[PDB]
Amino acid sequence: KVFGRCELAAAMKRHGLDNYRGYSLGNWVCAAKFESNFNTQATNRNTDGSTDYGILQINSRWWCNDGRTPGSRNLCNIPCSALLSSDITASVNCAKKIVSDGNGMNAWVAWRNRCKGTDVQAWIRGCRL
């Protein structure tokens, strides 16, 4: 599913991401924009052989099982395919674990490089939330 901007903001808020670990909703929408262009089915292979899945491009190296990432973990206890669903519950619940792991949203390199420090509230501007 390819979400609209305000549609995704609303879904993320319904699933408890607004101000989660102190990160306002616009941070999460901005991260999703540059990780996946709001497409739940996005996948990308990393140079190390791991793969990133879903709206927030969560990595099979640590967070989900795809059966093809040697030496990896599955800390969210989900198949990576669950991160591709039109229902964002699995991605949100796993993102909550990731952002709590010590480095906040810096875990998402695209957030650090493209969202951090910017006017992220623009990403939810005008949305009925």
Any idea which residues carry the catalytic annotation?
35, 52
Residues 2-41: x/- map of binding to Na ion (CB under 5 A)?
----------------------------------------
Residue 50 burial (CB count, 10 A):
22
> Which residue's CB is nearer to Na ion, number 13 or number 112?
112
Please enumerate, as own/partner, the contacts of 11-19 that have beta carbons within 8 Å and a separation of 24 or more.
11/88, 12/88, 12/92, 13/129, 15/88, 15/89, 15/92, 15/93, 16/92, 16/96, 17/92, 17/95, 17/96, 18/129
Structure tokens, 49: 């052989």
Give the range of 7-15, 21-29, 66-74, 89-97 binding Na ion by CB under 5 A. Answer: 66-74
Considering only 40, 51, 57, 91, the residue that binds Na ion (CB under 5 A) is: 57
Cα separation, 7 vs 26, in Å, equals 13
**Contact of residue 57 among Na ion, Cl ion, none (CB under 5-8 Å per partner type):** Na ion
116 binds Cl ion (CB under 5 A): no
Compare residues 60 and 124 and give the one whose CB is closer to Na ion.
60
Binding site, annotated residues for substrate: 101
Residues that bind Cl ion (CB under 5 A): 5, 24, 26, 69, 72, 104, 120-121
